[model samples]
Target: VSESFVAPLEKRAENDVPLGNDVPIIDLQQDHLVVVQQITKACQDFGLFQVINHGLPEKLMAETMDVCKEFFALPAEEKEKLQPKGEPAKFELPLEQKAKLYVEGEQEAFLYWKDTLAHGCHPLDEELVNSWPEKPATYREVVAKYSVEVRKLTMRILDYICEGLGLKLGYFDNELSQIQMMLTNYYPPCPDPSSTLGSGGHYDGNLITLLQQNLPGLQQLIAKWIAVEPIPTAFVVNLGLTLKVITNEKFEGSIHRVVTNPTRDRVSIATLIGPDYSCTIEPAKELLSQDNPPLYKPYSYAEFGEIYLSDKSDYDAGVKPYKIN
Candidate 1:
């Protein structure tokens, strides 16, 4: 059990159902009501669920994983050269250094950030490709293509979440207009597994998180560090604290963490979505009523991100920046 880790126990291991039985697969072409029901239940109960036939191609998924592995396989020093200087701004590490720098329990990792190029300058591209791992002829192109596609899927998911809350379909458009992505491909194989955790039990500071794990190396704490394995090819979707506040806590942000396998390595991609730095985040009017008051105060997403990013030793735990009415 992790010391001092306080988490929700709704879907703890004892109460968790397998991903095969728990994840909701909503077809874009199908009825929106059904999708809404599935998503709502998953959010309220599971805190995490997977989407299949939700549109990103299988081939793209495979190629993305390949490029990730290829990048991580590069020589340690070669990858280390790309490590962020002074401050780490998501996905700036070389394969070897990241593996060691972020190693926990029995897991190793590599990180990457996504930037969209525009007007021969990538106007919306917040990410600058710090380093590209050596790969086969078309690997780079393959990764770039997949990143864009996955982002599209992410936006669509956010839209659905907004709709489920009875807000306009595009209600989150401004908030999520400028999305940020980070991938930490994991490789777990540790001689000792009892002393540490792969990733600590924490809530994402963003609006939503879409996680894809190749190996069962990822685990969530239903209660304490009791490990729960999600189904394969399934994404673990968790509501972020911001989203919970926006929904007046009718929705929730569940606490979860990753653990490494003692015998084999794992790979995964985690996409985090949030409002742009300039956007203000507050509870939706429809979500707040005389009977249901807002639990959190309003704050700009930019301010939250800055505070969360500044603290290196822990996850998002900055002080409340606003007064609650």
Candidate 2:
């Protein structure tokens, strides 16, 4: 399995994709029109950008990071209290891992070199927030506030996206963004960073994804792969497949992955925004006509995500599975 996964990656000329340069970095404090234009061009060129001073406090962001780290550092007994199944068998690998068994004659199979904990964040249901880990003491409060603020930020950014696309202000319907999920990932140092990934290349299956990273690990495939450099208190932004589809292909969803380091660990918390399961998904009515027919067939987010989940690889041309021929 190791040889199988590394063979294709190694065959690609690694040096051809050296760390030779950079990506769009937007400052919310900059001129409003300039920020809008920069985000539009970034969506067109790279599908990813880093934003600074987007109104979330630097201290709160730092606290969020610290609380998450403290949660992960808790004793096994305290950690498993949140696990659905009682305890992790010290000897046997987890069931999710066993499911990834690399059988003979199959396409390459490599488990991501990271640990992840995911949960719902939006709507702030008391029942839901109460289920979150309490050992960290401030986890629920800080995480809840963080979710609220980021969701608001998404709207501000979406307004810019709407303006850039020549659509009416607040063009995105509320139903199309009624859910949010927070994913916290921890990637430990790897023995052979060259042969594995922190996460395989993939696109988030929603309208957009906002991410905060403690260190540099995320890479986007532009020429081959370029590091999305980690900067102080900056939030990374990228369009999602749903956005690309709704925009009539005006914007592209980024295909990104995480790379491991030999001695350094990494942490990132991702906020994914999606529509309700039953919400209809298609190009905006304003974006279509006899001149510009729909590029993709309409499908609900549930169907779209199910197809994505069954994928054999990290990337599957985004929403092309439903593309109209």
Candidate 3:
């Protein structure tokens, strides 16, 4: 039996389509309304966007990626010492262990978890389903810094979304407080690419995901397995199912997954921003009041998460339930 599975269609080039010019290049130090407008359109239309010059310094980004490579390159035994176990850890697991649960052919291991927040705020620790690992020097600090930065971007994007809808600013602010983040790393050298998926095609469960990638193998929108160009120091922003619901399906969650390559290792860091666990997820009231009608069942973040962590969520269910009333 052949381990490789080749798509019946010819592969698309990453740069051929380039992410639509509508996506912005935000500069952290400057208030670039033009960029924000572009981003808003991308989110409303494409449900995803990529940004460059978004303020995470190149050195920091490079070092972070380097540290990730260093950590993944460690001897299996060394890494196993800090391996995330049980249900709560989010990203830690040996390659073989994760592969068993994966429906696709890709191989990856992650170190993702939440950090405790301030008083009056429902802390992340209390809300997490599992405990985080104790080891890995500076892991929390590094991840937290990057996560906060991404959150900043998320907020700006959210504000832009509200503006596009003619809604008040920060309308979704409190709703997003418990937003969590996670990091993922993929080590390549796939034995076969065609039969197995690096990650199965599916939509994300969170409101949005801001991703920083350091590899060449990542693809987009599984419909075409579109190969996106490697954007150094840029963050790939993807909306999720929850956001789709909030927008009354005005926005979409792209169905995307990774594919394994027979050569080289690939690593990416993704920060997921979501609402507090207690927040009820449903179509936005504003949208609904405007005759959009609720398109989905009101769900708690925790309840929605249970399906996600259990691996029961189908990646192919692209955003749905929107019926224009």
For model 1 the local lDDT of residue 40 reads 83
Top candidate by TM-score: 2
TM-scores, one per candidate: 0.75, 0.87, 0.73
Give the Å shift of residue 293 in candidate 2: 2.2
Candidate 1 lDDT tens digits, 216-309: 6455444444344544455567778777767776876767765444577666777666666677777887778878876667777667766654
In what order do the candidates fall by TM-score, top score first? Answer: 2, 1, 3
**Runs with alpha carbons beyond 4 Å of true place in candidate 1:** 1-30, 85-139, 224-230, 309-316, 319-325
- Model 3 regions lying over 4 Å from their true place: 1-31, 84-141, 175-177, 309-325
Error of 3 at 194 (Å): 1.7
lDDT of 2 at 59: 87
What is the per-residue lDDT of model 2 for residues 1-325, given as tens digits with 9 covering 90 to 100? 2554342463222422455166888898889999999999988877898898799888888988888788778787776665555632211112121101111111344456666666667677887787667768898889888988888888899899988988988776488777776877778787777677676677777889999987977888874787777875988897898898888878878888777777877778888887777778889888788888988888867767665655635375436677884
Mark the 10 consecutive residues where model 1 has the least summed lDDT. Answer: 113-122
Supply the TM-score for candidate 2: 0.87
For residues 9-71, write the lDDT of model 3, one tens digit per residue: 233123233333444345444466776577667776677667776766677777667655655
Between prediction 2 and prediction 3, which has the larger TM-score? 2
Local accuracy by lDDT, each model:
0.56, 0.73, 0.56
